[PDB]
Amino acid sequence: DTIRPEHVLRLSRVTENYLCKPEDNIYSIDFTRFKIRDLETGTVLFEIAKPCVSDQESAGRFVRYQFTPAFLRLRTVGATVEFTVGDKPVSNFRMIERHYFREHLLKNFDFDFGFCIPSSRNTCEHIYEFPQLSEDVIRLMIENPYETRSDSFYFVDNKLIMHNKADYAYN
Amino acid sequence: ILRKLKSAPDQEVRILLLGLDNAGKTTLLKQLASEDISHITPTQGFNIKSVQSQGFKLNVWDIGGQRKIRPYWRSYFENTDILIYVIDSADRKRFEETGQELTELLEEEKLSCVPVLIFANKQDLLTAAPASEIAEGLNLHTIRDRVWQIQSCSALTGEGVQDGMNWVCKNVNA
Numbered sequence A: 001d002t003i004r005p006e007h008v009l010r011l012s013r014v015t016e017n018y019l020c021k022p023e024d025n026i027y028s029i030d031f032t033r034f035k036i037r038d039l040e041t042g043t044v045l046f047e048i049a050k051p052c053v054s055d056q057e058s059a060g061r062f063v064r065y066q067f068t069p070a071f072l073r074l075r076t077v078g079a080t081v082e083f084t085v086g087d088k089p090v091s092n093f094r095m096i097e098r099h100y101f102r103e104h105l106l107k108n109f110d111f112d113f114g115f116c117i118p119s120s121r122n123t124c125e126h127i128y129e130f131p132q133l134s135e136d137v138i139r140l141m142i143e144n145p146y147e148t149r150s151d152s153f154y155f156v157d158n159k160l161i162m163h164n165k166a167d168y169a170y171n
Numbered sequence B: 001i002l003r004k005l006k007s008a009p010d011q012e013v014r015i016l017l018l019g020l021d022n023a024g025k026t027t028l029l030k031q032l033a034s035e036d037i038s039h040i041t042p043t044q045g046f047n048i049k050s051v052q053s054q055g056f057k058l059n060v061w062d063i064g065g066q067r068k069i070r071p072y073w074r075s076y077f078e079n080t081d082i083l084i085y086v087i088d089s090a091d092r093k094r095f096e097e098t099g100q101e102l103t104e105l106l107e108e109e110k111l112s113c114v115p116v117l118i119f120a121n122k123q124d125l126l127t128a129a130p131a132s133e134i135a136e137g138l139n140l141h142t143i144r145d146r147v148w149q150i151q152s153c154s155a156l157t158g159e160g161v162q163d164g165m166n167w168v169c170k171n172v173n174a
């Protein structure tokens, strides 16, 4: 209830609870595909799409990934999201994804998609040069699995609609 | 030590890929992003490549060119820094058609002064018309109030793509 993008860019750590319910997704936006790939070698590190839903074992919108320490010495990574939109029109779709490690902002990805064609299927690949991490940060991130967490906020007309979270470990 | 705040510019470069359906826009974009192009489908929406380097962002937009998607092109015009227009050089039946679309694009006020690279794509084909012939058909030499450039290319092989991108990089900030 009343979460604007501005009151989210100022957060210093992962939120303790989801800031909206699955019922808030009134535009039937459905994320259908996710991909992480190392863009230096081209290797597809992780991908899950269309009929595949999980490889497992409050809210059902939480994933967490584990890597080997080598991941933290990668140069450039590419994360792709593919989502569909429904009948209702969507003007100014926005995405704010923040990765923290214990009140330490690692990476901020703020992308404004804008207008989304109804009944469309869209993709977005964020290609980032890995953030400048001091070796102290590497030590801590490796040694503390899943204390690196991320908030994925999705807005439509500056009104939060979807909130997914994630924890990352490098052991 | 050698830790240097060389960055901190917060720049934003916007490249917009347009053209008729089947032109090769998605193939070209995924080629540029060194990505799988084994199973490309008609884009019913947009594909974005957002490439970051410490606050410098290069955002590339591939909009679908289906007959039912072209009307929505006008929604993705704002803040465009380069327009890349792709033409199937082997589909001559559609030259006229594509010629009008580009003509509509360069009259849009929202896209005024934006440099436009015309990729005469699919030059790997025997039936592919040469770039000069396409530039004739398009009347590209009458283009005034912006810098334009045509480039023979094949998104499939990659031939010529770096030449067009060299032009794009050279004629940014225009």
Ligand SMILES: Nc1nc2c(ncn2[C@@H]2O[C@H](COP(=O)(O)OP(=O)(O)NP(=O)(O)O)[C@@H](O)[C@H]2O)c(=O)[nH]1
Pocket: B019, B020, B021, B022, B023, B024, B025, B026, B027, B028, B040, B041, B042, B043, B044, B063, B064, B065, B066, B086, B121, B122, B123, B124, B125, B153, B154, B155, B156, B157
């Ligand atoms: N021979 C050849 N085929 C090409 C070349 N570039 C693209 N194609 C092919 O032409 C077709 C056009 O597909 P695509 O790349 O999706 O074009 P598009 O611009 O995305 N069309 P849409 O607007 O519907 O998404 C595909 O079968 C693609 O493989 C090229 O240089 N040579």
Ligand SMILES: [Mg+2]
Pocket: B025, B026, B027, B041, B042, B043, B062, B063, B064, B065
């Ligand atoms: Mg396409």
